[PDB]
Scaffold this active site. Structure first.
Site, short mmCIF file in Angstrom:
data_model
loop_
_atom_site.label_atom_id
_atom_site.label_comp_id
_atom_site.label_asym_id
_atom_site.label_seq_id
_atom_site.Cartn_x
_atom_site.Cartn_y
_atom_site.Cartn_z
N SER A 1 0.83 -1.21 0.00
CA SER A 1 0.00 0.00 0.00
C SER A 1 0.87 1.27 0.00
CB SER A 1 -0.95 -0.03 1.21
OG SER A 1 -2.06 0.82 0.99
N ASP B 1 -9.67 -3.65 -5.41
CA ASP B 1 -8.87 -2.59 -4.82
C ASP B 1 -8.98 -1.34 -5.69
OD1 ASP B 1 -6.91 -0.92 -3.71
OD2 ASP B 1 -5.35 -2.46 -3.70
N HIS C 1 -7.88 -5.03 -1.10
CA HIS C 1 -6.71 -4.35 -0.58
C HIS C 1 -6.37 -4.82 0.83
CE1 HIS C 1 -3.83 -1.01 -0.69
NE2 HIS C 1 -4.08 -0.87 0.60
#
Length: 313
Positions: free
Chosen positions: A161, A255, A285
């Protein structure tokens, strides 16, 4: 494929929907960080073994940087490859504990030392503080490779991320500065740009753990009206990706960051960078830290670790 969402993911999201507690992003960061810690504690693997775990401070540009150094179970005395790891959490949340299981997983499965970096977080420290600390850590590992028993020719960076954002950015800064030498970049559903209106952003805007409104919240804490086109937060916007480290790039199907993650993988390939791209169509995600909840998470972490191991052989 009505929805290709993993049924274990649907189960998780439904359960999270039934919870009346405030969203992470409706909270002051203290509660947001704690809420995320608690989530991590329940959904990731606990009690994984490790050969050694050591907390220490290293010199940073703004003060000491806490790091955690992991040694694989039953490692020999030989110098090991090393993974410098930058945790996710939108540059605002996450810490050494939230990603500890993932770091142990990489250390054991890839057979490398792992150096996890407790980099400065926003809003207390805005952009580019996180990048400053993450770059400093990689420089420190290279310089002090002998002291911590690693091979300075086999340094990889990784992150998930916002951490994947940092791994990509650190790779670019290192290339420009002609050091430190980075041999591999493992980008786990990374943030690569600041456009919150891509097709995957709008299609996966809400309901899939990471939401569009979440990214807006993260960006606002991190970027202080900073140039959101600055390649140190938007590495997709770099003038050239030529010469960057060989890459392994993961995206999740549901995501909002899918499109820019795939885009970065494509742009790396087009610039001649050796790139392995894998998309998990049924995933959300954050799933690399959901190894207790998702079967696919364990498989994906192993696969990424094996790619890392093979690249640094």
């Amino acid at each position: 494929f009505t929805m290709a969402l993993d049924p274990q993911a649907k189960g998780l999201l439904d359960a999270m929907a039934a919870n009346p507690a405030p969203r992470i992003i409706d909270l002051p960061v203290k509660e947001a960080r704690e809420m995320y810690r608690g989530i991590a504690a329940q959904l990731d693997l606990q009690d994984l073994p490790i050969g050694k775990t050591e907390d220490r401070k290293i010199p940073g540009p703004a003060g000491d940087i806490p790091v955690r150094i992991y040694t694989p179970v039953a490692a020999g005395g030989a110098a090991l490859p090393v993974l410098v790891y930058f945790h996710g959490g939108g540059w605002v949340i996450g810490d050494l504990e939230t990603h500890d299981a993932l770091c142990r997983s990489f250390a054991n499965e890839a057979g490398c030392k792992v150096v996890a970096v407790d980099y400065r977080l926003a809003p207390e420290h805005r952009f580019p503080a996180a990048a400053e600390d993450c770059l400093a850590a990689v420089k420190w590992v290279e310089t002090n490779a002998s002291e911590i028993g690693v091979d300075a020719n086999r340094i990889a960076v990784a992150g998930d991320s916002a951490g994947g954002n940092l791994a990509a950015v650190v790779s670019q800064l290192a290339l420009a500065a002609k050091g430190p030498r980075i041999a591999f970049q493992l980008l786990i559903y990374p943030v690569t740009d600041t456009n919150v209106d891509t097709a995957s952003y709008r299609e996966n805007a809400s309901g899939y753990f990471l939401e569009r409104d979440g990214m807006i919240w993260f960006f606002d804490h991190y970027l202080n009206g900073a140039d959101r086109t600055d390649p140190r937060v938007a590495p997709l916007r770099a003038a050239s990706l030529a010469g960057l480290p060989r890459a392994y790039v993961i995206t999740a199907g549901f995501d909002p960051l899918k499109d820019e993650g795939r885009a970065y993988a494509e742009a790396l390939k087009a610039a001649g960078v050796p790139t392995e791209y894998v998309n998990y169509e049924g995933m959300i995600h954050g799933f690399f830290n959901l190894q207790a909840a998702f079967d696919v998470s364990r498989d994906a972490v192993k696969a990424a670790a094996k790619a890392l191991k093979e690249a640094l052989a």
